Structures are given as C-alpha cells and as structure tokens.
C-alpha cells in the first residue's frame, strides 16, 4: 500500500519542509519551497493573531506550518497528527526552532482533543474526513474557540456533475477509471465535499464564512513538480520501495494534477469567524 510508505519516500518528491497539500505561488516564478511556506503565510494572516494566543494545527503533517507560526508570531502552538510518523518527525524538527513560547506535538485525533485554544488551522486533514463526522467536527472546533475566535479550514474540494456539466467540463472514462482508483487505493469509502458543503456544515455548527479562496491551478503546478520529481527520483524510490508502489504513486500524482488541471477538482481556504 502507499500508506505504508516512510517519511524518506516522501522527501523524494516533496519540498525541504514536507508540505503535502496544495503550494501558493504568490508569484510565478516562486519555488515550490517559497511557494509552501506562502501557502502557510497566507493561512496564518488570516487568523489575526496575536502575541499570547494559543494556535491549534489539527493534522499538523510534517509541521512544516508550524514552523512559519513560530518563527513569525509570538503565540503558544498545538499540533496533532494521528501519523507516528509525522509526530516524531515534527517533534523534532520544532524543538530545533528557538521560541519564549510553550510547543507541544501530540499523537491525537480531534474527538479527542479538548483543550481551549484562540485560533484554529487545519491544510490536508479535513479531506480524510467522513461526512458523517463534520457536523461533530465543527461543533468541537466552535466549542474550544473563545467568542472572537477564528479558524482556517484549507481542503480539497470536489463538484457536483450538475456543476461539471454547467461548466463544459467533459468527465471522459479515463476519468472514471482513476475515480476507482481512488476509491480503491486511497479512499476506503470517503465522499469529498464540495464548496456548499463546506458552507452548510460551518454555518450549522454557527460560524460565519468570511472568505473562501480557491487556488485550482496552484495544485496542478504543485502535482506537476512532485510528480517530475518523484520520477527524477525513481530509481532511488524503487530502492526504497518498489516499482509497484512507484507507478502507484505516479499514477496518483499525475491523475490528480489532470483533474484540477481540466477542472474537476478544486482547493479552498475557508476562513470562518465565531
């Protein structure tokens, strides 16, 4: 399985801080490096922090954004991942950062964490969600927020065919096929949400949606460099692996860059206010 991959295969393809969600080339000619830690600054104004607050990452991945919270705002930071991987790979990468602020990593899911915090982020997390768990989501996420509390949601969004077809956009089988895929490799029965979704269950739970920004093309460019890179580094991914898992992830990595590429995916950032 893909799953079952170390964190060395993934720095074959990833950015030098292991970012595995969409980049945000502020300007064209950025780095997929400078476009991360863009991303991640882009996420973070948005919360309208403050020197003293406590800052949640639920799924903090590789801690890749924590760091940019650290290095650029003087707040106190959680992280949680369920990945073990992750958890000790952030550990240590955060403890390396100087800071008079407290920074904590925990191996913990979000029904469980339960801790008052200021602000909330989460990139890459929410599409591993079951839509029969956001309602909850939201209402712990609006629960632990103080009563000017902020949260940025970044996630992969999907269409209805009703969308798709208003839009000319022409699923072909291909598409299909790499929709089973999906559902096979990577999605052990997951509905990704679309954009109204998002709206319906935040506002359920009472927050306020004050923007939503949609960065479509930024992933394809995203796909399109961990793919070159994955096979720049091929041999060495074999190596660490298989050629079964690398073909996977080739074919994983180019088929998504095709549907944001032709427009059948998307990703947004969701600011909501409480």
Aim: hydrophobic share 40%; glycine share 6%.
């Amino acid at each position: 399985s893909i799953y079952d991959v170390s964190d060395e295969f993934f720095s074959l393809f990833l950015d030098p801080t292991m970012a595995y969600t969409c980049a945000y080339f502020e300007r064209e000619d950025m780095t997929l490096e400078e476009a991360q830690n863009a991303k991640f600054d882009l996420a973070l104004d948005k919360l309208h922090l403050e020197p003293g607050m406590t800052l949640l990452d639920i799924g903090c991945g590789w801690g890749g954004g924590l760091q940019r919270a650290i290095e650029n705002y003087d707040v106190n930071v959680i992280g949680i991942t369920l990945s073990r991987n992750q958890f000790e790979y952030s550990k240590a990468k955060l403890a390396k950062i100087p800071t008079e602020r407290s920074v904590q990593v925990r191996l913990q899911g979000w029904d469980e964490f339960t801790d008052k915090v200021d602000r909330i982020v989460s990139i890459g997390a929410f599409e591993a969600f079951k839509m029969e768990r956001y309602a909850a989501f939201f209402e712990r996420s609006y629960d632990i927020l103080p009563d000017d509390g902020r949260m940025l949601l970044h996630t992969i969004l999907t269409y209805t065919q009703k969308q798709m077809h208003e839009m000319g956009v022409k699923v072909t089988m291909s598409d299909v096929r790499f929709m089973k895929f999906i559902g096979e490799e990577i999605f052990p029965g997951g509905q990704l949400p679309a954009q109204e979704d998002i709206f319906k269950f935040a506002q359920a739970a009472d927050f306020s949606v004050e923007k939503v920004q949609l960065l479509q093309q930024h992933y394809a460019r995203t796909l399109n460099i961990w793919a070159a890179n994955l096979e720049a580094n091929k041999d060495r991914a074999i190596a660490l692996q298989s050629e079964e898992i690398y073909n996977k992830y080739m074919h994983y990595l180019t088929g998504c860059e095709h549907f944001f590429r032709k427009g059948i995916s998307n990703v947004g950032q969701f600011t909501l206010t409480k």
